[PDB]
Design a protein around this ligand. Structure first.
Ligand SMILES: Nc1nc2c(ncn2[C@@H]2O[C@H](COP(=O)(O)OP(=O)(O)O)[C@@H](O)[C@H]2O)c(=O)[nH]1
Ligand SMILES: Nc1nc2c(ncn2[C@@H]2O[C@H](COP(=O)(O)OP(=O)(O)O)[C@@H](O)[C@H]2O)c(=O)[nH]1
Lengths: 196, 227, 255, 227, 255, 196
């Protein structure tokens, strides 16, 4: 019933975040995933196994090579899958919708997503959050991930926190290492509080 | 305060939100198998596809539900839709046209100030398996839009999306896209004339390699499209 | 020139599928069952004639009794000659009973120059019935390089399960209205297989595998709206298609 | 073998490759400044924008070059285009309509089998600063497309792109997009009637806040659009 | 009731910009130059009358001789009364010579209920001339809450450089044909500044700065097709606009 | 005259590659950059300084938040900038066109680019090249970048080389560390040979 979209660049940890999220939360919550990030048939599988979910709880939806349109101005097939997921699960309280990988201008249509989580990572640059796209400013929650890579790429996390707080105002953001489950509890806390 | 002259442009607008761009209806298979590699082979594909799958399934079905809608025969309309569903074997092609039909209706209904009339509303409540073409046919008759005109806009709109799929995926220069669309104008008129001539015995006339490529689309190693 | 074939089967006194009743007139030649597997009976259908001419018509009636597991293999080719201002026709009504399995296909069609052929096939099944049905169509006599010289070909299929339609096919081929060589129809190939598996103990991925092993076949399988399987395939000769069909029939009859 | 009934759908197609989607014509400024936040304010923006910038600059200029083209007066056509260029102060709005004009002509010319006729070819050679609307005006007259019809399609196509910009950037639900397009049908008809009435003394009638917002678009801290 | 103003300037015997010739009739009151900077002369233009009435017409002619650097500041408000079935008009022709600079604006317009006003401004420049020109229009008498009650207002500008047009403006305001309060026209503000800088020693970023420092101004600057600058601004009163204009004029006359 | 497009995910090193490329090559070659990866005015600047190029040799072109369409089915404004760059530089022999950041389905219209370089990086995953998008298979050259991050993220470079060679056939790919100028000579050699 409550829809939360997850977008961000390719390789930023959108999938890792959704897998680690359902691993924790699916125990206490009725939930499912729709995902646009798929090419090969062996993609949708790997997400089911890693997330400890039954296959009926994950639907892949192709974008025609237009991942921005698919979540934004014509969300039609994603919206069709949402209505499908409601047919399968009448008690569904939480639905995670993952984009096909994108850039800082990525947004969700309000018809598709009730809340939005944008995911970037430290190795893309520390000057990313000041570039200021709608993914940085508009999203209900920003996630900065792979903080463990910081000293190896020369990424200044004070800079990133400074610039992020400036851009989002009082809109929350969370530093993260998903492999180490680090900050993962913060994200989970946010979803319970905000989206309920 | 509805003007049909604008409404027809609106529902045939490429950005009208039914999700056509996510569907290749088998074209993606033809491309990965190197049957459509350039402008000339793309035009060959389009002429052959429009004269088979599109003429006998899409266009003819639109005329049929239009005519039935004029007499307010709901039973015949649902019968045409059952035939299409039982006759369209490739799964992704069947589901594509159905999903597009769902989206088309849901979008018209979302506009609360458009009064579709008692019959279209009755149709929208009962329909089990509408497609884009059948629901559109009922839509046009309900509003008193002239058949030949309704067909012209629908044909152009659906074809433009196929040509754009060619431009994106082959790829082709966007100019080649436009030359193709220009070349198709004589065939467009032949198709419309043919659609007016054909009776319902031709409905869902089988294609061969088109169906096979639409089925093969399910097993592609890597792919961008839903059909 | 009305040709008939009528066949009715039952589980016999020895527990085996047997012919309960039959009848036929030429060209049809029906042979007696043999038993490759325990529950599996096989009956060969043959043809003794040099083809159909203007005015010719065939009527086939199959009735497969409850618990019968039967394979009917048609070992000939149906050739349609120039029919002039007339046509040749084939009508078939097929009935499959409870817990019965039928594997059947009519003779592959080879239309000659100016051949006009019509056919209609109706099949009634019960919810517990199982069916493997197929049809092959050829472009012409490929030996002499006659491709799509026929007048018109129209064949239809309807399959009903407990009186409810679960499948249709409408095949209309008219070389005067289209180029049947185009990439959406025959696409340079000369031979076409269309095949349906209703309620069979086989997974889509298993059928997909047989197709992949088949050499010289461009073909595919998919799930119908009624949750059954449909296979379509193209080839440069009848053998690759007939062989593929054998492999599929084998996958279902070992289960 | 050209059919004007198809050609008019083709050049007004949202995917006709002129790059309209990269331009907001100042709308992006209204959005970042929280003047268009929802469906109701978007409809307010659209009504006001179409009644000012679009009516007196775009639509009227199209009618003017149409009429001059009919008499094969190339001099008056180039004069209208000079007026528009010298009268449109905001740079990104000026450059937007010019670039779209370049793309429109280059695309028509790229289709070698379309014969535009001696006059349009002469126009295409001489024009210094064509816009989408002026070049379209010459195009329609050259092909004997009826003025009122030419205006109707052009108005719808350009407006749909503005509404989609609202859907993408506000954002709005795609359904709101469709409600807006339906609400605008009475205004569309008023605009067309007005365009037929207006003489050339009204050409490039000044807007005020629209121009200012179009200029402010240059200095936005972060932005997605070219205008 | 034809009012005139004619003015011609030249570099005087003392090296200063001086009035070579002039003439005027009421309402116009012209004053004598004063010298804020070395090369900069300033001449005040004033108005002694209660406004324009039906049939009234003004004709202004300015000729600014070579090497003159001149600032003409209009210190009054031009009020247009109810003109009934007639109209009031203002025609201005302005000529700026080689290496000459002119800073000029006509009186801000305050149209009353049912006022009908027409105006035409033509300006000829030489490639070496420099120009700062502006116009202010207000909604009505804001004091008494008269907003957009006038009949019709139409004003035009053409600027030519060596006989070649480099800029046009066509301002038509008719409260009967549109709601001038809408977010594309006056947008709730009552006062509008339109200003052009031709061939001035100033950068776009400099002008953009003055605009940002100005309080109570919603405004902006941009480059014209001819590579000159245009500024437009809205305000709730004349002073914030007049002040902004002073700051811009200062940026060009210090260089 | 010879146009080469550069696409790849956000943070993969597209800009770093183009800057390091012009630093070396602009000495012996008449060349320019068109770039869709811009948000803030201070973006286009930073590319000029880092690449040691005059500002007239770099044109930024906004995408309207549609970076895929901008290089693919309607390339109009990019194509307009190409014709502009030919007006500025009549002797121009090489034109680098950078996309706005994208995913594995990114391709260039043939009217826009004569050749294509796709850029991914090691930290996105080692299973990226087997996902097999048109960016992996179709591009004239693939670049795998940030190889120095390999041991820290657990990325198997034998795996990446195996899978890449499989997918591209005989279409060349090059391992790379751009910060260390490592493999940079290979890329330069490719451009000289192939695109000439
Ligand atoms: N070093 C590090 N790697 C991570 C972290 N989170 C995810 N990854 C890795 O980053 C790569 C990309 O993650 P993925 O989920 O595929 O990103 P996606 O493309 O947005 O779905 C994978 O190899 C992950 O294992 C992290 O916190 N630290
Ligand atoms: N460790 C490592 N970092 C790199 C390498 N190349 C680039 N980077 C860093 O990764 C980020 C890539 O940024 P950029 O080139 O602008 O990515 P773009 O979004 O594709 O244009 C920058 O912060 C670089 O400092 C490399 O070879 N190794």
């Amino acid at each position: 019933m409550v829809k939360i979209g997850v977008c961000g660049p390719v390789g930023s940890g959108k999938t890792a975040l959704i897998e680690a999220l359902t691993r924790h939360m699916s125990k206490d919550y009725d939930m499912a995933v729709i995902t646009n990030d798929i090419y090969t048939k062996e993609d949708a599988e790997f997400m089911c196994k890693n997330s400890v979910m039954p296959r009926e709880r994950i639907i892949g939806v192709e974008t025609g090579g237009c991942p921005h349109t698919a979540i934004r101005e014509d969300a039609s097939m994603n919206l069709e899958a949402v209505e499908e997921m409601h047919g399968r699960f009448p008690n569904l309280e939480l639905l995670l919708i993952e984009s096909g990988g994108d850039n800082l201008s990525a947004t969700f249509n309000p018809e598709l997503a009730d809340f939005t989580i944008f995911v970037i990572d430290v190795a893309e640059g520390d000057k990313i959050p000041r570039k200021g796209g709608p993914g940085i400013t508009r999203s209900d929650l920003l996630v900065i991930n792979k903080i463990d890579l910081a000293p190896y790429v020369g990424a200044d996390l004070k800079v990133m926190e400074r610039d992020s707080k400036k851009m989002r105002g009082e809109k929350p953001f969370i530093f993260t290492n998903i492999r180490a489950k680090e900050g993962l509890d913060d994200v989970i806390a946010w979803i319970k509080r905000n989206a309920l | 305060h509805v003007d049909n002259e604008f409404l027809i442009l609106q529902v045939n607008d490429a950005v009208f939100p039914i999700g056509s761009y996510t569907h290749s209806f088998g074209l993606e298979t033809y491309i990965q198998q190197k049957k459509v590699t350039n402008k000339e082979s793309a035009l060959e594909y389009l002429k052959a596809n429009l004269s088979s799958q599109f003429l006998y399934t899409e266009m003819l079905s639109l005329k049929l539900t239009y005519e039935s809608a004029l007499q307010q025969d709901l039973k015949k309309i649902l019968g045409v839709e059952e035939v299409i569903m039982l006759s369209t074997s490739p799964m992704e092609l069947r589901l594509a046209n159905q999903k597009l039909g769902n989206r088309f209706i849901k979008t018209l209904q979302a506009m609360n100030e458009l009064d579709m009339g008692e019959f279209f509303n009755a149709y929208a409540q009962k329909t089990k398996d509408p497609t884009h073409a059948t629901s559109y046919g009922v839509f046009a008759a309900s509003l008193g839009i002239e058949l030949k005109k309704a067909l012209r806009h629908y044909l152009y709109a659906q074809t433009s999306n196929m040509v754009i799929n060619c431009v994106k995926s082959v790829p082709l220069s966007q100019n080649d896209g436009q030359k193709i669309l220009l070349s198709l104008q004589s065939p467009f008129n032949q198709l419309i004339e043919k659609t007016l001539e054909l009776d319902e015995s031709h409905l869902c006339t089988a294609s061969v390699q088109n169906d096979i490529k639409a089925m093969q689309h399910e097993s592609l190693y890597s792919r961008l499209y839903m059909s | 020139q009305e040709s008939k074939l009528r066949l009715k089967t039952k589980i016999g006194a020895d527990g085996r599928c047997v012919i309960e009743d039959n009848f036929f007139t030429p060209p049809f030649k029906l042979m007696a069952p043999f038993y490759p597997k325990d529950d599996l009976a096989e009956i060969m259908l043959l043809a003794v004639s040099p083809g159909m001419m203007r005015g010719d018509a065939q009527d086939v009636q199959l009735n497969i009794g409850p618990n019968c597991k039967l394979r009917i293999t048609s070992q000939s080719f149906e050739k349609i000659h120039n029919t002039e201002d007339g046509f040749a026709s084939r009508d078939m009504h097929i009935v499959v009973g409870e817990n019965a399995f039928l594997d059947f296909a009519p003779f592959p069609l080879i239309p000659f120059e100016n051949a006009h052929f019509k056919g209609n096939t109706t099949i009634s099944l019960r919810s517990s019935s199982q069916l493997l049905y197929s049809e092959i169509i050829v472009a012409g006599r490929v030996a002499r390089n006659e491709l799509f010289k026929f007048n018109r070909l129209h064949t239809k299929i309807s399959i009903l399960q407990d009186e409810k339609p679960i499948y249709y096919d409408n095949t209309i081929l008219d070389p005067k209205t289209t180029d049947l060589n185009n990439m959406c129809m025959f696409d340079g190939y000369t031979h076409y297989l269309n095949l349906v598996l209703v309620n069979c103990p086989i997974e889509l991925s298993g059928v997909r595998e047989c197709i992949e092993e088949s050499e010289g076949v461009d073909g595919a399988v998919s799930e119908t709206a009624s949750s059954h399987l449909c296979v379509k395939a193209l080839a440069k000769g009848s053998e690759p298609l007939l062989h593929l069909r054998e492999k599929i029939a084998r996958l279902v009859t070992q289960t």
